[PDB]
Amino acid sequence: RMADLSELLKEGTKEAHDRAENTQFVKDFLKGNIKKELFKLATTALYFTYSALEEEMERNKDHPAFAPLYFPMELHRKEALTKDMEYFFGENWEEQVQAPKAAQKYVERIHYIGQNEPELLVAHAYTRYMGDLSGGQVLKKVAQRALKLPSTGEGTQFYLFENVDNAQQFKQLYRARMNALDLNMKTKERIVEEANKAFEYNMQIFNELDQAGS
Amino acid sequence: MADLSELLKEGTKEAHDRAENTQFVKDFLKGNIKKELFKLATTALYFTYSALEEEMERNKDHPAFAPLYFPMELHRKEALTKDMEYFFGENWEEQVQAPKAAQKYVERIHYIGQNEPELLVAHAYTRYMGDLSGGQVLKKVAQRALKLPSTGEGTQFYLFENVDNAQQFKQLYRARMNALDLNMKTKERIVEEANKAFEYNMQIFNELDQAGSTLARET
Ligand code: HEM
Ligand code: HEM
Numbered sequence: 001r002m003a004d005l006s007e008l009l010k011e012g013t014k015e016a017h018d019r020a021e022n023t024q025f026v027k028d029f030l031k032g033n034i035k036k037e038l039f040k041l042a043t044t045a046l047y048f049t050y051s052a053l054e055e056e057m058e059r060n061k062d063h064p065a066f067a068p069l070y071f072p073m074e075l076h077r078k079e080a081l082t083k084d085m086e087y088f089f090g091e092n093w094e095e096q097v098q099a100p101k102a103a104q105k106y107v108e109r110i111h112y113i114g115q116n117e118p119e120l121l122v123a124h125a126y127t128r129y130m131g132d133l134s135g136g137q138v139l140k141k142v143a144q145r146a147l148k149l150p151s152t153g154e155g156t157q158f159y160l161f162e163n164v165d166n167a168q169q170f171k172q173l174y175r176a177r178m179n180a181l182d183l184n185m186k187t188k189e190r191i192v193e194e195a196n197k198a199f200e201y202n203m204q205i206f207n208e209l210d211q212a213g214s
Numbered sequence: 215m216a217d218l219s220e221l222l223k224e225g226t227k228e229a230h231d232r233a234e235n236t237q238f239v240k241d242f243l244k245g246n247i248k249k250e251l252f253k254l255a256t257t258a259l260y261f262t263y264s265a266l267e268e269e270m271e272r273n274k275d276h277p278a279f280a281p282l283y284f285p286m287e288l289h290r291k292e293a294l295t296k297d298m299e300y301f302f303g304e305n306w307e308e309q310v311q312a313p314k315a316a317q318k319y320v321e322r323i324h325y326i327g328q329n330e331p332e333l334l335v336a337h338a339y340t341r342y343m344g345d346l347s348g349g350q351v352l353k354k355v356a357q358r359a360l361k362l363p364s365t366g367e368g369t370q371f372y373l374f375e376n377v378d379n380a381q382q383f384k385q386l387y388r389a390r391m392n393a394l395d396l397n398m399k400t401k402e403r404i405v406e407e408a409n410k411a412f413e414y415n416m417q418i419f420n421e422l423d424q425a426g427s428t429l430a431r432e433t
Binding site for chain 1: 314318321324325391416
């Protein structure tokens with residue numbers, strides 16, 4: 001069974017995941033070292049890639065190689081980030097935004113795959129959403145304590161999946177479906193290789209956010 | 215359209231242009247640097263090269279990198295492992311940690327070698343093709359400035375005791391990179407990262423500059 005797309009991807013992106021857990025921006029975040037301005041930008045970055053990613057998934061919502069993975073009800077974060085961008089920046093937020101150069105590359109790549117290698121879109125949904133379902137609960141608590149944020153969710157409506165009531169088993173439904181997709185082994189390897197690229201896109205954002213400290 | 219060996223130089227223009235001009239560098243070519251800082255730098259080198267060297271070892275048989283594998287002539291690990299002996303002592307391995315501006319550049323080198331090997335050449339050309347140019351001087355320069363053995367003791371990093379003529383070897387290297395067959399934006403990409411690689415060094419330089427000041431601001 002270690003031949004399932006979800007199995008391949010896990011073993012296939014292990015090294016990249018380790019780099020992510022240990023990247024200085026992530027460790028300094030978890031310790032509560034990141035202040036508000038670097039949090040407002042972290043969110044800003046998050047917004048783009050997820051808005052872009054969701055518009056792109058919104059595009060192939062009925063594609064044979066992505067159809068099931070489509071889950072606007074349970075996953076999409078744009079409605080959440082938006083409310084979060086409203087809390088920190090305010091309704092005016094829109095007329096202020098500016099993405100980390102890396103976030104830009106990230107998005108452009110989310111668009112390329114958007115019409116060129118569509119059978120690899122799952123690599124971007126996987127990397128981002130699945131991670132979100134694994135430790136979002138913890139990140140929410142760290143963010144609230146360091147920035148003195150309300151427990152009622154203000155500013156963090158992003159780290160919470162209102163429509164998902166059980167992350168653990170939820171991701172299983174996702175793995176069961178990722179594997180169900182009609183895919184040849186040749187492409188899967190391209191998917192795994194694409195998930196790894198995706199982590200690096202996040203690695204680059206994490207890298208740019210750190211320097212932002214100075 | 216053209217040889218990759220020139221697209222890099224022409225392409226990274228601003229990189230090696232915004233490189234000969236970095237406080238840490240100007241403060242180096244001459245002789246004003248504080249031993250304990252030179253030790254920070256050497257540490258950065260150890261972790262950067264250990265990573266870059268493993269990735270090339272991994273991609274040695276990769277058609278997109280094989281022609282640029284020169285372990286016995288270009289590698290610096292063994293050497294650096296020694297230039298860290300003289301400075302940090304013996305059991306320094308368990309004490310010294312990879313500085314942050316270096317850990318970034320590092321984590322990246324493991325990505326490339328593992329996921330985008332056709333770009334490993336960019337990092338190789340960024341450091342090695344660089345080390346070979348004007349290395350001997352650096353040793354001596356740091357020796358007299360830090361009261362170190364002229365011979366090179368403690369800094370065998372700047373000396374490749376396995377390469378005869380430097381200009382001849384590098385000219386050799388350029389011909390090897392050009393023989394590589396790839397796409398077009400592939401060269402553009404390779405160059406993009408050589409610049410990306412430079413910045414990585416930049417972050418590492420002043421990261422030391424400010425670190426050396428935090429060593430001066432105290433007195
Ligand atoms: C300190 C930081 C992080 C920690 C401690 C962490 C921890 C974990 C843990 C324990 C799991 C395993 C859950 C399971 O398999 O059921 C997981 C899964 C996941 N994480 Fe992370 N993670 C971190 C950062 C990230 C980042 C930065 C990304 C990518 C941007 C990421 C992407 C994922 C993905 C895709 C999964 C699902 C793997 C799978 O089940 O196939 N994680 N993470
Ligand atoms: C310490 C200050 C520096 C000085 C004075 C300096 C000087 C030079 C000189 C004169 C050359 C010879 C040109 C040739 O190869 O024909 C050269 C080449 C080179 N240097 Fe620098 N350099 C410096 C810093 C750097 C830095 C920070 C890097 C970046 C890692 C670097 C990377 C290179 C590379 C890649 C080459 C090969 C160029 C070629 O293709 O010919 N150098 N450098």
